[PDB]
Design a protein around this ligand. Structure first.
Ligand SMILES: COCCCNc1nc(Cl)c(-c2nc3ccccc3s2)c(N[C@@H]2C[C@H](CO)[C@@H](O)[C@H]2O)n1
Length: 286
């Protein structure tokens, strides 16, 4: 697939010379080291990711284009174009008005809490995006709620393919990802789609509880450990369900938790593949 060849100065103009301030009062954030700026061009709102070692920075930009050229799906963010003529390298995407699942789970800037009904649809949507990537022999290497973007109708879109790796178990010296979401073997340097499943189980626990993967002022500081308190019969998942929901029945919440439990197996070979995860989430609703 081919993309629009945007000029650096057109992107510099529509993003106000790459301003570092927020929208209130561009800056948005940086998932894979590249400041995302809000922009408007050709009567359509966009998100411009300016990248941002010199060759490793360029390898992050080249992979994104190589992966998105091949990968086209409704549950992945769309790349509209990019820019090479400038000093820095830019990647233009279709703007997502509901931000990340992280910011919507935390109600950042006063947004209403997502209902259980929207949460199930986002879980199913996110799991289609991972299935399409794995079907097409790609490992995301950074599955987290901050990397699940939400469109005009709260449709889950996986994003950030700067760390994406082809498959089509390999080992690596430069270990990359988000500690709070990573699997045991990923933290050791193994590269496998089985790690993407583990990280997705952490996202399901954030969806159910509404608690972020890591909270420094919390006990336990890591969300994945809450699974062990529930397994020891000290607490139940019922006691961790997000209280900012009025439409969450126990059967569907327990059913989502069963998937998150299986996803979070420490033994990589005991975890279910994405196609099984997708079937279980579909059976949950239905
Ligand atoms: C005013 O309403 C707010 C809506 C903001 N909407 C929005 N829209 C898009 Cl298209 C992106 C992209 N971010 C990336 C990052 C890498 C690759 C592709 C993309 S597309 C984004 N990223 C931010 C950075 C962060 C990820 O860690 C998230 O929490 C976001 O804040 N935020």
């Amino acid at each position: 697939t081919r993309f629009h060849s945007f000029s650096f100065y057109e992107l510099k103009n529509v993003t106000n010379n790459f301003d570092e301030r927020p929208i209130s009062v561009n800056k948005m954030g940086e998932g894979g080291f590249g400041v995302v700026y809000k922009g408007y061009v050709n009567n359509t709102t966009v998100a411009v990711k300016k990248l941002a070692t010199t060759e490793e920075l360029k390898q992050q930009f080249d992979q994104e284009i190589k992966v998105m050229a091949k990968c086209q799906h409704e549950n992945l963010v769309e790349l509209l174009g990019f820019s090479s003529d400038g000093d820095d390298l830019c990647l233009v995407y279709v703007y997502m008005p509901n931000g990340s699942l992280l910011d919507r789970l935390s109600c950042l800037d006063g947004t209403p809490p997502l209902s259980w009904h929207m949460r199930c649809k986002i879980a199913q949507g996110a799991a289609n995006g991972i299935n399409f990537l794995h079907e097409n022999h790609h490992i995301h290497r950074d599955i987290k709620s901050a990397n699940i973007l939400l469109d005009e109708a709260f449709t889950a879109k996986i994003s950030d393919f700067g760390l994406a790796r082809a498959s089509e178990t390999v080992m690596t010296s430069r270990i990359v990802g988000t500690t709070a979401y990573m699997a045991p073997e990923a933290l050791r340097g193994e590269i496998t789609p089985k790690s993407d499943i583990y990280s997705f189980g952490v996202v399901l626990l954030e969806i159910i509880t509404g608690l972020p993967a890591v909270d420094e002022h919390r006990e336990p500081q890591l969300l994945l450990d809450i699974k062990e308190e529930i397994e020891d019969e000290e607490k139940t998942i019922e006691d961790y369900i997000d209280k900012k929901m009025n439409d969450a029945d126990s059967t569907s919440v327990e059913a989502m938790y069963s998937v998150a439990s299986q996803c979070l197996h420490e033994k990589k070979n005991k975890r279910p593949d994405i196609k099984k995860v997708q079937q279980l989430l579909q059976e949950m609703t239905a």
